[PDB]
């Protein structure tokens, strides 16, 4: 703040840290999942 | 890392002549003080050995 | 750290800052109460 009288040592006691993790939007899958799957037990 | 706080040096107030206490100069002076902060760390150390 | 795989945003994100508060050595003071004191009530 560097305004009043007192001041505190520096900006890490200015500001308050979260442990919330955000993610944008991201695309969509389509292709992965819409065919039959033919299982094998061979080469 | 660890970080603690340092407290700053000491203050002096000012003597004020009788002749200024009508004025604002009745107050004094502002005594002001900034605090500090301190780090600590560590290293690695390893041996190692085969039977 | 930056060493494994996944990493950290920045250096605040891995301290701890404590709110302890210590000090150095003051001078001492000697002439402050050694003498008496003289109330007084006029100029």
């Known amino acids: 703040n560097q305004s009043s009288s007192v001041e505190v040592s520096s900006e890490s006691y200015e500001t308050i840290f979260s442990q919330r993790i ?11 999942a819409l065919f039959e799957e033919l299982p094998m037990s061979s080469k | 890392i660890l970080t603690m706080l340092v407290e700053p040096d000491a203050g002096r107030a000012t003597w004020v002549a009788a002749s200024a206490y009508g004025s604002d100069n009745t107050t004094g002076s502002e005594v002001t003080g900034a605090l500090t902060e301190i780090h600590f760390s560590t290293y690695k150390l390893a041996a190692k050995s085969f039977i």
Chains 1, 3 share one sequence.
């Open chain 1, 22 to 32: 955000i993610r944008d939007l991201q695309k969509e899958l389509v292709v992965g």
